[PDB]
């Protein structure tokens, strides 16, 4: 499955640059990006991000530019929902680009 | 005061959510309460049961299950007549709640404060100060 399906048939997405299918090559890479970016929200916890936001808020207080809507790390549930949304968007997008460039070139 | 073992249990058809071997070899909890009606409630361990008019008695595995049911009876059926016991396999029955006849959220004389620390939380000792020492971090 790795060699004869994913590796062999990803030839069209990765060789698509400079053709009419170059949009699929770009979406292949962009969806790989979004999928990986989702793991930042899925493997992480809210407490780290609230403590990081504290130092960023400090730098805003120093310049007297802190917002009146106090920044918070996303909720625990929202960190999970954002991770899941970007995971599905990236994985489905990677397959969408792979399937369409492959079958448009060969079928 | 002691649990009258003969109190009739609320009608229930059984479930898999009840207590397991640890109840018959480590400890079991019991709850009794008075109902003015023969009415349906929800068991903490599963589906629905019917509490009988008069005195009811249940057996559960965890203290939190007895208190989750107690919270429910008080909130919906306004039953504040609930007494929670711990039962050991030796036959010893241990009264648990309310521990001195008065609910914990109401003050009572003769209660001695346990766990109370004379300073605020920021005045504790640093871990390095009490390293290789038995002294407690609460001052």
């Amino acid at each position: 499955w790795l060699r004869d399906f994913l590796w062999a048939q990803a030839s069209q997405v990765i060789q698509s640059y400079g053709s009419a299918l170059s949009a699929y090559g770009l979406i292949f890479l962009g969806a790989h990006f979004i999928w990986a970016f989702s793991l930042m929200f899925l493997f992480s916890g809210r407490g780290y991000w609230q403590e990081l936001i504290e130092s960023i808020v400090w730098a805003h207080n120093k310049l007297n530019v802190a917002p009146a809507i106090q920044p918070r790390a996303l909720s625990i549930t929202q960190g999970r929902a954002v991770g899941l949304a970007h995971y599905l968007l990236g994985g489905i997008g990677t397959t969408w680009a792979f399937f369409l460039a492959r079958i448009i070139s060969v079928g | 005061e002691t649990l009258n073992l003969q109190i009739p249990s609320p009608t229930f058809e059984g479930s898999t959510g009840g207590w397991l071997r640890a109840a018959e070899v480590e400890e079991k909890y019991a709850i009794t309460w008075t109902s003015p009606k023969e009415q349906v409630f929800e068991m903490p361990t599963g589906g629905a049961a019917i509490m009988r008019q008069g005195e009811n008695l249940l057996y559960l595995a965890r203290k939190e299950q007895c208190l989750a049911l107690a919270t429910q009876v008080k909130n919906s059926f306004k039953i504040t007549d609930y007494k929670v016991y711990r039962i050991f396999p030796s036959g010893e029955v241990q009264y648990l709640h309310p521990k001195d006849g008065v609910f914990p959220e109401k003050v009572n004389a003769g209660r001695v404060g346990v766990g109370n620390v004379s300073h605020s939380i920021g005045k504790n000792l640093n871990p390095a100060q009490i390293k290789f020492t038995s002294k407690s971090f609460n001052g």
């Binding site: - | 640890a22 648990l96 109401k106 001695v112 346990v114 766990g115 605020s120």
Partner: protein, 80 residues
């Protein structure tokens, strides 16, 4: 068991005592605050470590503090 402490910033609001699912906390008399009462932790052997008491506490930093410790059947929440 878990270790539960009450610091003398307690305003005697009784909210921790009402929120505790395992009847660990209760109110005792105390002249320090306006309410005339402070929270107490006489039954920490029953503490499961849920930290609902800490959620209920309204003082700026928690007057009630749970310190998770050695695990037992009671504090692990095991019905088996």
């Amino acid at each position: 068991s878990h270790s539960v402490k009450v610091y003398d910033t307690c305003i005697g609001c009784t909210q921790c005592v009402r929120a505790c699912p395992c009847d660990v906390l209760e109110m005792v008399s105390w002249d320090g605050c306006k309410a005339g009462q402070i929270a107490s932790a006489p039954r920490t052997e029953d503490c499961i470590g849920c930290k609902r008491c800490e959620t209920a506490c309204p003082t700026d930093f928690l007057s009630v503090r749970v310190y998770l410790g050695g695990e037992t059947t009671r504090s692990m929440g095991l019905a088996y």
